[PDB]
Symmetry: none
Subunit: 251 residues, 2 copies
């Protein structure tokens, strides 16, 4: 309908700036039927933002209703799976929280790293700590990143000591080299007491400065970078474009 699509697109952008998510859905729904299948992705995020402000009213069940509408809009949205997970955890339904959250593996494998702080407090309190270490082991070799590698490395330093963990990360750091796991060299720093002990911790600190100063996430549209995760990019105003930085300088 020519100029009418332009007016909707503007209205759609302005309604997100004014954090008017319900109005943003109305405009986005019209664009979906006008041929803009890409706004399907953004409608699910709008239900996620609506649900977020329903959680601030404690109406956790109305929030869960918004998330199911969001899942209806985007089956592949990993954000709805994470938020439905937080709900099932709030209710103590730790089994259903693992059934979602693990949906992220099929939805966006670059975001499985985000479901690991939860799913840990889910396997714990479900009584399945051994099944958890198997999940991490199957996640590290599936290449989830330095996050899963170090969560697994912690479990072993407590089950089998500081010596069997040093030999573990050495093998994994070959298979998947990353500067963060190399920093875990403290394992060598637990020994060695001469002139080189005073030569090795200076090398570690150099690595340590880079581990904390280097950003953790980058937008795939523009170059935006941050230490935490954003669903909406504060530079190009896109959705689902910020993923963890994969590489030596990252995870």
């Amino acid at each position: 309908t020519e100029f009418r699509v332009g007016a909707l697109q503007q209205l759609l952008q302005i309604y997100q700036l004014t954090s008017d998510w319900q109005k943003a859905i109305e405009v986005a729904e019209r664009l979906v039927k006008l041929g803009k299948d890409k706004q399907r992705i953004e409608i699910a995020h709008f239900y996620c933002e609506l649900a977020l402000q329903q959680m601030g009213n404690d109406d956790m069940d109305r929030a869960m209703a918004l998330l199911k509408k969001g899942a209806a809009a985007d089956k592949n949205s990993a954000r709805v799976s994470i938020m439905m997970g937080r709900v099932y955890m709030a209710r103590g339904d730790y089994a259903k929280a693992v059934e979602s959250l693990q949906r992220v593996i099929v939805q966006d494998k670059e975001l499985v790293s985000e479901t690991l702080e939860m799913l840990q407090t889910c396997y714990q309190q479900l009584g399945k700590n051994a099944e958890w270490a198997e999940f991490l082991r199957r996640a590290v070799e599936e290449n989830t990143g330095a996050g899963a590698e170090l969560m697994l490395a912690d479990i072993l330093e407590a089950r089998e000591g500081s010596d069997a963990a040093q030999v573990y990360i050495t093998r994994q750091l070959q298979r998947h080299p990353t500067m963060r796991v190399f920093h875990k060299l403290m394992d060598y720093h637990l020994n060695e007491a001469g002139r080189a002990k005073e030569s090795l911790m200076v090398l570690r600190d150099m690595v340590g400065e880079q581990v904390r100063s280097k950003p953790r996430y980058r937008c795939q549209k523009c170059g935006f970078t941050a230490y935490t995760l954003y669903w909406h990019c504060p530079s190009c105003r896109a959705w689902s474009t910020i993923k963890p930085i994969r590489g030596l300088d990252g995870q």
Copy 2:
């Protein structure tokens, strides 16, 4: 119009000829588009010549290749690839004086490719006995942030005069001013050199792991499509662009 139709047909011939490595036929079509007003083709014309000069360099015909390179220089005054290939031609003919001249034109044509000229220039300056001027060129190159290759080159030269310690404090300075895994790797070698006692074994295994990443990581990336490569490809196998592959800058690279 009738001219816009003919332009579109030349572009189709130029595409088919690039794709078949028919550089001679590609130059003919490209020269026609230049006549019509598409001057940006002169960039593709110089690469077409450099592909031909690469054919003649494979038959030890340095005079035929240098003739083609002069034609490429005439099409593209700014092609840094021409300057480098004329360095290889002068150097095989023993003309090390002229080799420095064309290789150094890269500083103007494409500052991101100067690191690709350092090893031949180091060879040109030792053959002329101008090893002291090479050091001055390198200090200027390190300060203009040419890369870890220049930083490491200057660090061997700084050892050939004042040894360790003196070269180390320079590297630790450059490492802080410009962190790279590669320079970090060299800093590790300075810390075990003249420093055995079961901690060297701890450091030596860490230095190997770093060096294992230095020898095996790709150093080049296409700026247009992000394709990475171990060699400097002038024609990007992925997106087929010309002179988009540059050395990877950063921690992962120079």
